[PDB]
């Protein structure tokens, strides 16, 4: 039982078989949750401004014993509202002020503070504030900041091998990416040598980075390699061999073991021999001397007597050296293992490549890399190396970086430091060597467990931190210099740097762009957009071919459908419906827990990494009553390879079928019957729809339109409402009932609708009320309908009656034939609004004025101008009429008798002014909606600028006096009630207030005090009303501050109604678009047996080649819905009794498989059925979920209820000949929408206009009547044709041949048609530009 009083007007039938478990989320959380936590006062400093301050705020003088701290920051209250900011043109922001503390301490005392200056806070910049819709109002225009998707800081063991190696060998490098600082890369060479690289610059040998960290050869060897004892005493030459530790090598000769020999000479090593050698205890066994020559020594050995450098570290043993080292040095020599099969040194080969053996020579190598010249002096190189990586305030990567680092190295601990560590470096190199030898797997960059998203709040925090670190330097300098002062804490705290940084980020940035404003869907999908480009990630749309593919981990996190089809395909994505952000920034998605067969209601959010372990079932899986599975074998996903599993192996199940698609692609009915390409194109073309005059709901939907319309913030929803008092075309007031009311307020909620305001796309934004007087309204119910919304549903388009048949070739390839009735009924008619502005721009000759005293103009031109010089509101203006009469002063009139005579005769002109008026651009026509004038402070011309001022003041007075009137009425009722039974009737109070006769009863009881208190309260209420009115008036008439040159600004808005015509581009929701080719009269259009003509004829030759069965299914379902609506309309027209209508509606609502229980006659009264039927008389609304839609059998059944042919076809007749078409045709109702590509804005023509000063060519792409561009391919075409004369003509006469253009024009006007080619001007420009270099060039004869 769903009441939903706003929805009970029109209930949309659902074909959803599956039961919904989790409700759709807020749909705009990603944009505003981050910003909310960015400016939230956190008791612990983790994120936001509290974390940005604690980073680098404590300022310590250069041994000046004077510090600077802060107590807390407070966010100021915004100066203007969002609507005020938008009408003005200023930015919406809030001042920031933080209480600081400057402490000065005397010398000769350890931390002995003598004075504190913690008494004044300093304002440092303004933060642009976010509205209720996850959008900013920067500079008066709504802007949205897109989230970024980059690689999380950490360590990545990418392969980077294959064809790019150019040697047929695989490589294994490793990169450590920090959040801030320099990058460190550990490559490999085809010579099996590793090299360290910083900032992708010239490489270095392997162990220089080790030697820089005070590591010597002995520790490096003993740490990276394992050393065997090699105890060879008394020339025994015996080896401690462990078959379990090392094996797999065939024995050469002279190999023995305990008891029998381990392996015979020349015999292959066997697992049985290894097992025997492991079972029997094996002591030191003797081997031939050949094993010593190839082996290398681990440490440096020194003779007992003297300390020569014999047997140097990392040196192969020699036969001659062996005798002397055994005689003099020692008997047991440390050595290595160095087996190719399962190991590889890869470092000892590099140690000899190192030119530096001491830390002294090693440390300067990195300085040589970093800086070419200026060799260090034992204080620069060490400082640079310590500050590059191991400094706290220069690397400081992240918590996420440390978390990834520890997870990728099998470390339990997660809380680490932003500084790197030597041990971390050795672990990284060891794991690189391990993966080279074969110990694990290389990483995957495309995996969504390796990429995290950055929202607006955290990038704003980063920009603020960058801006603050700059002013920290100035504060420190001013504190160090001239510290002998007791001034207020404004020594160097300048708000301009921080404010400039934040304004630069918010206003002009790659991720900050104008919001789309032509659809609620367009807005709500621009706010959920995810881009890979920007300050980071992929620097350009190039350099990627597998980055832009659909990775298997994109299941419930990003949409595989919605993405542009241009150069940046795959680099722009959209979140799924349920996708949420992890704690650190990764993407999650909800699942239901499955316990021992049953499916619980509890929801667990799993990131990309977690979902790879468990076995997750499928949403299209049958379920029992208790939560058991019907079939023993169910389809699941285990590690990226879906297959069949039993009911005892599953661990999770998907929430709903809408989980893998975004909000854009979940509005397409029958999405599973459309190809991926066509679904992508339909989703992309849905956003371009431009709203029409009358909104029309879709007869075939998916149920997501209600949620999209509500969450888009484009309607006017009722908060804490109980009943409606007064309804108007532009105002709604709701009398909140006492249940949802708290004391201290009148109890009136007022909503001011938005009427005909320009959008970012020059479209129209209009809100229309839905409720009537005395209509009870609940909480969360809509009250107004924004652009393209119908009773709270997203309605972008109209239900056209289509027919699928060829028609004399007027729908040849992608063209559409439209009936004239469509144009007559004003479907697809659109309203467009433009903005024109003019400025005064005072001069040294004198200020410019708008006085309408314009010279050299006729009285007809100035007919539409007011006294001040600006157009009347509502006047119609076309072409080049005058909008604002502006004049620019000229120089002083000369004493010359000619000008003196002109002044004496005519006067009032004196050539003082010139006609620089604002005129409508050519080919622009419309009617003026409203003007807006802005005058700077100190200028009080205000010719007619007071009219809008008075209008705003009166509107404020009207909307402010209502609450005071309600409070006064309540107080008067209280007085009338407290004077009851006191000998005074209510007649006197109704006649005259008299303050209840000032307690004329004089009972001396509490009544006198009550009347005195009520009089005092009334006086206080009146004073509050006057104060509020004066404050509103002062905020209204205060005046604006403009640019220094600008004196005043006048803005004019024009509204244009654009209708449908051939050339305009229509579309559907299934990736089918087209251009109107003809508008056919109603007589010719094909008609059926009842005389009703179809509205649009479409070509059936796109369906089989584009796989768009969704179109056909949609038309069949729409035909069924319209049949039901027509039957209901007929029963209403017959004025039949309520019982039969109710029974028919119930039978039409209960049809189909088990989907949803809804019944009339138990919740709907006798009256609600009337309005429900009157709402759904133009068609039965139907909702089919995305992958859970209606079935063909159910569509055929529904067609039978409205008495229609179940096949979907119908016989049609030709309108011009009256002869029946054989092969009956398919008619239906498709939801067609009009796109933003109109032929009115496409046509452009030119014969001769204005050229550029340089190169003398026509301007360009309609930039003030520009020309069109012949190109290299077009000249190739002309040359292939052999069109020498046409080519020469296009080269010279139509272009920069200055002396030839005029001659050709003259000859054409005279009727000659002859050409004088001459020479182009661009070639002369090229010759001059070449001669501007020291290169002589000229033309000979």
């Amino acid at each position: 039982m769903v009441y939903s009083y706003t929805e009970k007007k029109r209930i949309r039938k659902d074909f959803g078989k599956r039961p919904q478990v989790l409700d759709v989320p807020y749909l705009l959380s990603i944009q505003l949750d981050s910003f909310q936590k960015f400016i939230e006062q956190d008791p612990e400093g983790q994120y936001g401004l509290e974390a940005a301050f604690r980073s680098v705020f404590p300022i310590q003088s250069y041994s000046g014993n004077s510090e600077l701290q802060y107590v807390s920051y407070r966010l100021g209250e915004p100066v203007f509202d969002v609507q005020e900011c938008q009408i003005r043109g200023v930015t919406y922001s809030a001042p920031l002020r933080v209480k600081l503390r400057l402490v000065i301490y005397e010398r000769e005392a350890p931390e002995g503070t003598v004075k504190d200056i913690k008494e004044q806070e300093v304002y440092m910049g303004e933060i642009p504030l976010m509205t209720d819709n996850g959008t900013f109002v920067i500079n008066g225009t709504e802007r949205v900041i897109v989230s970024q998707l980059h690689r999380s800081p950490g360590v990545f063991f990418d392969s980077d091998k294959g064809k790019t190696h150019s040697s047929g060998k695989v490589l294994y490098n490793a990169r450590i990416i920090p959040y801030r600082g320099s990058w460190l890369d550990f490559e490999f060479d085809p010579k099996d040598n590793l090299f360290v690289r910083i900032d992708r610059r010239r490489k270095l040998p392997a162990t220089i980075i080790l030697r820089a960290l005070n590591y010597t050869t002995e520790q490096i060897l003993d740490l990276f390699f394992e050393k065997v004892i090699f105890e060879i005493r008394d020339n025994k030459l015996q080896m401690e061999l462990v078959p379990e530790r090392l094996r797999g090598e065939t024995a050469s000769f002279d190999i023995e073991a305990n008891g029998k020999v381990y392996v015979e000479k020349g015999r292959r090593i066997t697992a049985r021999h290894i097992r025997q050698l492991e079972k029997d205890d094996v002591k030191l066994i003797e081997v031939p001397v050949e094993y010593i020559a190839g082996k290398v020594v681990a440490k440096d050995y020194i003779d007992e007597s003297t300390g020569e450098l014999i047997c140097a570290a990392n040196m192969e043993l020699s036969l001659d050296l062996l005798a002397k080292l055994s005689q003099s040095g020692h008997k047991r020599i440390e050595t290595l293992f160095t087996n190719d099969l399962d190991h590889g040194p890869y470092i000892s080969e590099t140690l000899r490549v190192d030119p530096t053996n001491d830390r002294l020579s090693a440390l300067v190598e990195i300085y040589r890399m970093m800086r070419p010249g200026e060799p260090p002096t034992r204080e620069a190189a060490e400082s640079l190396f310590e500050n590059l990586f191991f400094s706290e305030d220069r690397y400081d990567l992240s918590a996420v970086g440390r978390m990834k680092f520890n997870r990728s190295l099998l470390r339990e601990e997660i809380e680490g430091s932003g500084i790197l560590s030597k041990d971390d470096i050795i672990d990284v190199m060891k794991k690189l060597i391990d993966i080279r030898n074969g110990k694990g797997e290389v990483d995957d960059i495309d995996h969504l467990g390796n990429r995290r998203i950055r929202s607006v709040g955290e990038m704003a925090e980063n920009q603020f931190r960058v801006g603050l670190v700059r002013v920290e330097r100035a504060v420190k300098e001013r504190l160090s210099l001239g510290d002998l002062d007791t001034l207020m804490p404004q020594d160097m705290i300048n708000a301009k740097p921080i404010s400039a940084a934040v304004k630069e980020f918010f206003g002009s940035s790659q991720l900050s762009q104008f919001m789309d404003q032509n659809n609620p869907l367009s807005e709500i999908t621009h706010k959920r957009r995810i881009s890979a480009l920007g300050p980071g990630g992929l620097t350009r749309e190039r350099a990627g071919f597998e980055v832009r593919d659909v990775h298997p981990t994109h299941y419930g996190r990003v949409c595989p459908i919605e993405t542009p089809e241009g150069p940046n395909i795959g680099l722009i994505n959209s979140l799924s419906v349920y996708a949420q952000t992890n704690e650190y920034g990764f993407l999650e998605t909800p699942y239901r827990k499955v316990t021992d067969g049953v499916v619980t209601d509890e929801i667990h959010y799993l990131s990309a990494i977690e979902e790879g372990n468990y076995v997750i079932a499928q949403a299209n899986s049958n379920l029992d009553e208790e939560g058991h599975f019907v079939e023993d074998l169910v389809t699941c996903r285990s590690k990226g390879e879906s297959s069949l599993f039993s009911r005892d192996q599953v661990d999770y199940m998907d929430v709903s079928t809408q989980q893998v698609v975004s909000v854009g692609a979940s509005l397409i009915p029958f999405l599973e019957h459309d190809d991926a390409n066509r679904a992508l194109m339909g989703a992309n073309m849905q956003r371009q729809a431009v709203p029409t005059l009358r909104a029309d709901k879709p007869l075939v939907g998916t149920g997501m339109e209600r949620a999209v319309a509500v969450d888009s913030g484009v309607t006017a929803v009722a908060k804490r409402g109980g009943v409606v008092q007064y309804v108007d075309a532009s105002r709604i007031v709701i009398k909140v009932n006492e249940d949802e009311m708290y004391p201290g307020e009148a109890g009136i909620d007022i909503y001011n609708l938005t009427k005909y305001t320009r959008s970012n796309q020059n479209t129209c934004i209009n809100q229309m009320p839905c409720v009537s007087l005395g209509e009870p309204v609940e909480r969360g119910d809509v009250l107004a309908d924004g652009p393209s919304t119908d009773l709270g549903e997203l309605a972008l388009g109209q239900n056209m009656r289509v027919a699928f048949m060829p028609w004399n070739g007027y729908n040849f390839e992608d063209s559409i034939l439209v009936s004239e009735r469509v144009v007559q009924e004003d479907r697809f008619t659109t309203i467009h609004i433009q903005e024109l502005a003019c400025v005064s721009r005072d001069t040294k000759l004198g200020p410019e004025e708008i006085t309408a005293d314009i010279p050299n103009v006729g009285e007809a031109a100035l007919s539409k101008l007011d006294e001040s010089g600006i157009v009347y509101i509502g006047a119609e203006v076309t072409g080049g009429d005058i909008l604002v009469g502006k004049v620019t002063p000229k120089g002083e009139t000369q004493l010359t008798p000619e000008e003196k005579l002109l002044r004496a005769i005519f006067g009032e002109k004196a050539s003082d002014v010139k006609d620089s008026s604002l005129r409508v651009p050519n080919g622009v026509s419309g009617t003026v909606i409203d003007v807006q004038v802005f005058t700077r402070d100190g200028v009080e011309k205000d010719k007619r600028a007071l009219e809008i001022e008075e209008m705003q003041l009166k509107q404020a007075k009207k909307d402010l006096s209502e609450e005071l009137q309600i409070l006064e009425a309540g107080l008067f009722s209280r007085i009338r009630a407290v004077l009851v039974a006191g000998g005074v009737e209510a007649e006197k109070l109704d006649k005259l207030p008299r303050d209840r006769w000032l307690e004329l009863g004089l009972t001396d009881e509490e009544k006198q005090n009550q009347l005195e208190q009520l009089a005092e309260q009334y006086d206080e209420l009146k004073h509050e009303f006057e104060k509020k009115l004066e404050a509103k008036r002062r905020k209204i008439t205060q005046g604006d501050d403009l640019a220094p040159g600008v004196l005043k600004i006048v803005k004019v808005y024009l509204a244009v109604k654009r209708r449908i015509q051939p050339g305009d581009k229509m579309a559907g929701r299934h990736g089918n678009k087209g251009v109107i080719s003809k508008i056919n009269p109603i007589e010719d259009m094909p008609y059926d047996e009842n005389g009703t003509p179809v509205d649009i004829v479409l070509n059936p030759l796109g369906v089989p080649s584009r796989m768009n069965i969704g179109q056909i299914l949609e038309t069949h379902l729409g035909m069924a819905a319209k049949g039901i609506g027509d039957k209901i309309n007929a029963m209403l027209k017959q004025q039949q009794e309520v019982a039969k209508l109710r029974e028919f509606i119930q039978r039409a609502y209960d049809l189909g498989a088990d989907v949803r229980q809804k019944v009339d006659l138990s919740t709907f009264s006798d009256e609600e059925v009337m309005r429900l039927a009157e709402n759904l008389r133009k068609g039965m609304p139907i909702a089919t979920p995305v992958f859970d839609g209606a079935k063909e059998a159910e569509i055929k059944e529904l067609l039978k209820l409205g008495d229609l042919p179940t096949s979907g076809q119908i016989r049609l007749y030709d309108g011009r000949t009256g002869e029946q078409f054989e092969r009956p045709v398919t008619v239906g109702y498709m939801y067609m929408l009009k796109l933003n590509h109109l032929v009115d804005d496409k046509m452009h023509a030119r014969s001769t206009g204005s050229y550029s000063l340089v190169t003398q060519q026509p301007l360009g792409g309609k930039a003030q009547f520009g020309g069109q561009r012949f190109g290299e391919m077009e000249v190739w075409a002309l040359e292939a044709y052999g069109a020498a004369y046409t080519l020469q003509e296009m080269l010279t006469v139509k272009s920069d041949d200055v002396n030839g253009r005029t001659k050709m024009y003259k000859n054409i006007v005279d009727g000659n048609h002859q050409m004088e080619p001459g020479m182009p001007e661009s070639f002369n420009v090229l010759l001059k530009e070449i001669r501007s270099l020291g290169i002589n060039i000229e033309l000979e004869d």
Partner: peptide
């Protein structure tokens, strides 16, 4: 990009010469 190569304007003398040419 910085704005360059402005348009050419039609002054009185140029307009009168244009009309003389025809």
């Amino acid at each position: 990009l910085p704005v360059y190569q402005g348009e050419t304007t039609q002054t009185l003398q140029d307009y009168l010469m244009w009309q003389v040419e025809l």
